[PDB]
């Protein structure tokens, strides 16, 4: 229906609101609107630099009695500069303090790559290479497991992990908690068929990020493809009397993925939720899958020699 079962027994809403690039001055209103029109899943991160303002909106709607806390599914992520085992708890507590919550529904390792700890989110050397930390995936995972044991988070997962990285965790000797979710970039130009098959086969729920192709991403080039403007996808939308955005959001839902489109624009927040009253056909699905180009929008050149860089592998 509208939620997917996780390995902890919780039900994760299949549609959530993304908040990357939602400025602090606009995100509070965005979240308020989203909760009013039915969103019950918000995707957050420390690196988005807006958790306080998301937290404001959630607090206001709890106090207004619009929703109760157990009806909300709040996700955040551990940033790359906090992979050291001793920094993980503090990072989670900082996120909880900013969001004004006492627990998260889901906390992800944001990227498999640890960066040098410090004030800078992207510590670069003078030649522009990211500076790694001497952290590894398995030790970071162990610190994430402690958060569940301490009741700060209900479920833990990963983001931007390739299948070998997922495998590494699943095969961890003394594994305490299996990853619940892998959050990955997924859209018609990067359909992720092998990694989705892998993760679903392993009972890991997949969340599709950048489902509209992140047209506001800060490194977009003029000559880059644009999903929302793809005349072929416009044609599918017109046939169903829907928008291109609604098709792009429905697409992952029919693959049994969670999807988290971002908007700060109230009309679009509402538009993006109106995706439960139509179905894409088998032909439409096949057609959208056929647009795959292995075109990835979320990666940084500056990280490509990190030992744990995820996107050298086929999947
Ligand atoms: N785990 C990770 O590493 C990671 C990476 C990337 C993204 N994410 C998550 O996934 C979320 C979504 O990805 P994203 O932010 O990259 O991009 P996206 O959701 O693919 O696209 C957002 C862009 O599309 C616009 N838009 C939204 N609804 C629209 C509609 N109905 N019609 C036309 N334009 C529309 C937004 O404009 P306005 O906001 O101005 O309306 C914004 O410019 C993020 O916000 C974040 O929560 C996670
Ligand atoms: O991380 C997100 O959820 C979205 C996001 N993506 N990016 C592109 C990035 N790409 C990467 C790539 C790596 C990698 F794992 F080394 F591959 C590690 C960290 C990053 S962050 C930003 O530069 C970035 N900068 C600020 C805030 N968010 C971002």
Sort strands 11-13 and 3-5 into parallel, antiparallel or unpaired.
Answer: antiparallel
Query: Which technique was used to obtain these atomic coordinates?
Result: X-ray
Distance (Å) of CA 174 to CA 145, 152, 178: 11, 21, 11
Residue with the smallest CA separation from ligand 1 atom 32 is: 245
Strand partners, 124: 130
Cβ(158) – ligand 2 distance below 6 Å? no
Enter the tokens of residue 202: 């392993």
Interval between CA 298 and ligand 2 midpoint (Å): 6
The residue whose CB lies within 8 Å of the most ligand 1 atoms, and thus the one to mutate among 15, 251, 263, 297, is: 263
The CA distance from 130 to 306, in Å, is: 8
Catalytic residue among 48, 177, 189, 209: 48
C-alpha 170 – ligand 1 centre gap (Å): 30
User: 191: Cβ–Cβ under 8 A, 6 or more apart, which residues?
Assistant: 288, 289, 291, 292
Q: Is 264 annotated as a binding residue?
A: yes
Active site residue 309: no
Number of structural domains found in the chain: 1
Nearest in space to 84 (alpha carbons), one of 135, 32, 9: 135
Which residue range forms the structural domain that includes residue 148? Answer: 1-315
Q: 85: domain CATH number?
A: 3.20.20.100
Please report the resolution in angstroms. 1.6
Query: What number of residues does the chain have?
Result: 315
Taking CA atoms only, the protein residue closest to ligand 2 atom 12 is 299
């Amino acid at each position: 229906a509208s939620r997917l079962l996780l390995n902890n027994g919780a039900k994760m809403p299949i549609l959530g609101l993304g908040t990357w690039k939602s400025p602090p001055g606009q995100v509070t209103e965005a979240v308020k609107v989203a909760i009013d029109v039915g969103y019950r899943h918000i995707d957050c991160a420390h690196v988005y630099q807006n958790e306080n303002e998301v937290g404001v909106a959630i607090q206001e709607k709890l106090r207004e009695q619009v929703v109760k806390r157990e009806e909300l599914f709040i996700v955040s992520k551990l940033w790359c500069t906090y992979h050291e085992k001793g920094l993980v708890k503090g990072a989670c507590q900082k996120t909880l303090s900013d969001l004004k919550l006492d627990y998260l529904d889901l906390y992800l390792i944001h990227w498999p790559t640890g960066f040098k700890p410090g004030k800078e989110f992207f510590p670069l050397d003078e030649s522009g290479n990211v500076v790694p930390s001497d952290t590894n995936i398995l030790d970071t995972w162990a610190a994430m497991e402690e958060l569940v044991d301490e009741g700060l988070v209900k479920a833990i997962g990963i983001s931007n992990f390739n299948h070998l990285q997922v495998e590494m965790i699943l095969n961890k000797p003394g594994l305490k908690y299996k990853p619940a979710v892998n959050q990955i970039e997924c859209h018609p130009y990067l359909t992720q068929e092998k990694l989705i098959q892998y993760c679903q086969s392993k009972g890991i729920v997949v969340t599709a990020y950048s489902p509209l192709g992140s047209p506001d991403r800060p490194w977009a080039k003029p000559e880059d493809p644009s999903l929302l403007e793809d005349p072929r996808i416009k044609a599918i939308a017109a046939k169903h009397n829907k928008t291109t955005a609604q098709v792009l959001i429905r697409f992952p839902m029919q693959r049994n993925l969670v999807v988290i489109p971002k908007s700060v624009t109230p009309e679009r927040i509402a538009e993006n939720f109106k995706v439960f009253d139509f179905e894409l056909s088998s032909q439409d699905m096949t057609t959208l899958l056929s647009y795959n180009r292995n075109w990835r929008v979320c990666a940084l050149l500056s990280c490509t020699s990190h030992k744990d860089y995820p996107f050298h592998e086929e999947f």
